[PDB]
Amino acid sequence: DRLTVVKQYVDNVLNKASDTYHGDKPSPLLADGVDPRTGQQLEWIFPDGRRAVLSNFSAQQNLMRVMSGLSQLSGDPRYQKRAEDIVRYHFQNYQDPSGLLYWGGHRFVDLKTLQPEGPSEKERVHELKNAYPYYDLMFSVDSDATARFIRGFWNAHVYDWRILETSKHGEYGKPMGALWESKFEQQPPFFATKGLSFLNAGNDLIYSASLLYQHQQDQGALTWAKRLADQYVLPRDAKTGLGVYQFTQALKREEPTDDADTHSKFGDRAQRQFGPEFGPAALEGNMMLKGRTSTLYSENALMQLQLGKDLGPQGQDLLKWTVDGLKAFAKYAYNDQDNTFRPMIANGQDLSNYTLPRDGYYGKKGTVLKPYKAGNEFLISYARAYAIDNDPLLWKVARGIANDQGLGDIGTAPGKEVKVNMDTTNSDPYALFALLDLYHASQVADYRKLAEKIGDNIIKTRYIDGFFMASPDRQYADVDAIEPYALLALEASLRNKPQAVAPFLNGAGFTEGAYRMDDGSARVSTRDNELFLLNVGEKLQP
Ligand SMILES: O=C(O)[C@H]1O[C@H](O[C@@H]2[C@H](O)[C@@H](O)[C@@H](O[C@@H]3[C@H](O)[C@@H](O)[C@@H](O[C@@H]4[C@H](O)[C@@H](O)[C@@H](O[C@@H]5[C@H](O)[C@@H](O)[C@H](O)O[C@@H]5C(=O)O)O[C@@H]4C(=O)O)O[C@@H]3C(=O)O)O[C@@H]2C(=O)O)[C@H](O)[C@@H](O)[C@H]1O
The missing domain is CATH 2.30.30.880 (SH3 type barrels.)
Known part of the structure; x- marks a missing residue:
């Protein structure tokens, strides 16, 4: 029984991952990792x-959503209470005067x-990349402390508000500047800056400001959230619509002397490694390579599709931007013969099977860029985009991924000639999430029946020694595992309470x-x- 399994799992986390170092006065905090065989914490x-x-509290925000969802579906408030207590403890003890938390990539x-x-x-700084913390929970515990975090995040990571120069890291202890009142002057695409405007951190800036708007009706937060989102749309290639992973390029401060020294102070790293053969369009923001395209066409898309819907009429541009980009990626990069994406430059250049001719940021000389399999995180984003815009191009990508993943044929269209594989061995929580999205929009029973099979496979093959693990041979289980999150989403669907579980945006910590x-x-x-x-x-x- 799925709900019983998840309850047992969270009970196990609260036993084995808890503070055992302070006698009978433990803090409420949890260890990120536990060897499920012995209880040894990572x-x-x-x-x-x-x-x-x-x-690292930034690496526990799927667990926080799991605990809130478990309390909603089970009616047992102890899990919500513990999640609240952990939030409260971090605001009480681990939030500096500028509002930033001691969490993230380097704390x-x-x-x-x-x-x-x-x-x-060399990096005692604040860093969130594709983190998507559970701000809804945080606001319900302490709205002023949550708002102080979100304003402090923007205050530290926006280096220059006039041009919206952003950075993936920020310093602690900064005084508050003009923030949303700052004057803005839009700059042309790929202006040169010191700060690195990577979209993994940009995702967290956009999302956090959008949640500050949602909870506190902060119109300045919303204006800048939309403006930052627009910064990634304006530089998109005028012909292909592809891109971008960042909207600035590195300010060249020194002349490079060695290909393998890829410090950003020597200028845009893609222009160094690809410029001689590909010309001025080779810029980091334009490199549509593995990983970068997950941040862009999965993590950014999940967040922006949900935000665009939440905003109603004033979210239509965001929805159009997001779906347009997914269409462009499908049109240029997807190969439906073998469910791969081509490595590309955003001008439309195919880099499939290209051998790198020199060392650089994207690999050593002799590295071959190959087409890469489209994973289930893209099944989610294409399923959700199709729900908003029933475009057969979007369906083709979803159908190709599902087929490649052993799920069978989701049909020529939703509900048309469906032939799903009810004997699948797939145990990927991402596939479970995506099938729930296909089911929600189409109301085709076979998609949720298949999701039930994936849920049973998750329990059969990944619920091991009381924890969820990607393989039975892994040393440590991650308390932030999303297997129980997918199981709860499945239960919420079956119980006709989808709002009992927070929307899945594929955040994680590191x-x-x-x-x-x-x-x-x-x-x-x-x-x-x-x-x-x-x-x-x-x-x-x-
Ligand atoms: O495997 C993947 O593809 C990988 O992709 C993402 O991660 C990438 C990259 O792989 C990561 O290593 C990281 O790189 C960032 C820079 O691109 C990298 O050059 C490096 O930058 C450092 C400093 O962090 C940066 O602040 C600059 O620092 C200046 C100076 O050198 C420094 O000494 C001084 O204190 O501050 C200076 C300044 O402020 O300008 O430049 C440095 C440099 O060496 O160039 O590290 C960066 C980082 O750690 O963020 O992130 C990349 C990204 O795209 O986020 C993905 O996130 C990974 O999970 C993985 O998929």
Whole structure:
């Protein structure tokens, strides 16, 4: 029984991931990772060998949504209460005077000492990339502290409000500037700036300001949310409609001397590595490569489709921008013969099977850029876009992904010649989410019946030792796993209470810094993502 499984799972998290380091006076905070076999919590190793237990609240915002949803569907308020208590504790102890939290890519809390940590000593800064925190919960606990965070986030990460120069990181302890009252002057596409306007952090700026508007009716927040979203639309290629991952280019401060030194101070990294053969259109924002296209055509799309709907009449432009881009990506990059996307430049250039002729930001010389399989995160974004605009081009991508993923044939159109694979072994929570989206818009029973099968596969093959794991051999389970989130969304659908579970935007957290190896050496740019990929007996490789 799915709801019973999720309740048992969250009970297990609150037992095994809890603060066991302060006797009978524990904090409410949780460890990000737990070995489900032993209960060992995942640790970060600092240069002197001190071990901290990783508690990064930005990497727990799927769990927070799971706990809220579990309380809604079960009627047991203890999970909502604990999620609220964790939020309250972070505002009480881990929010600096500027409003920023000790979370994100380069800050976390040590569950043993309850001190904020900074694992990247050259980077003791605030960083959110495709995080999408559960601000709805935070506002219900403390609306002023949540608003202070969102304003402080923009205050630290907007380097120049006149031109909307943004940055993926921000400093703590900054005084508040003019914020939404700042004067703005729109600049031409790909103006040169120091700050890096990557859309993974831009996603979090747009989303947070939109939630501040939703909760506090802050019209300045909404104006700048829409303006920042527009910054990623204005530079899109005039002919293809593709792009963009960023809307500025790196300000060239020094002449480069080595291809393999990719510091942004030497200028746009794509223009260095691709400029000689491809010309001026080779800019970082225009590189439609694996990963970048997930941030653009999945994470940004999920958030903007939901925001566009929420805004009603004044969200129509946002919906058009978002769907137009997904159409362009399908038209140029999708290969329906083998369910791949072509690596591309946004001017329409195909980079399939291109061999890199020099070292650079996008790979060593000799690297071959290959078409890459379209994963289930794109099944979600194409399903949701089709619900808004019933375009057969969008359906073709959804149908190709589902077929490639072993789900069968979702039909030539919703409900037309459906032949789904009810014996599928697929256990991907992303596929479950996408099938619920196809079902919600079409009301075709077979899509939810297939979603039930995926849910049963998730329980059968990923519910292991009381936790959810991507493989039975993984060393650590992630308490932010989205398997239980998909299961709750399925239960909410079956119970005719879809609003019981927060909309899935595919956010996640990460932690990055130097990590100490057993020989005492420093492994720079280590990520907790890497720790969660280890199997039993495996260690991080240099
Ligand atoms: O595998 C993937 O594709 C990867 O894609 C995303 O991540 C990419 C990239 O892979 C990440 O490494 C990261 O890169 C950022 C910059 O592009 C990179 O050059 C590096 O930048 C550092 C500093 O972070 C940056 O602030 C600049 O710093 C200046 C100076 O060098 C520094 O010493 C000084 O203190 O501050 C200066 C300044 O403020 O300008 O430039 C530095 C440099 O070396 O150039 O690191 C950046 C970073 O950590 O954000 O993010 C990329 C991204 O697209 O976000 C994806 O997020 C990954 O998950 C993965 O998929």
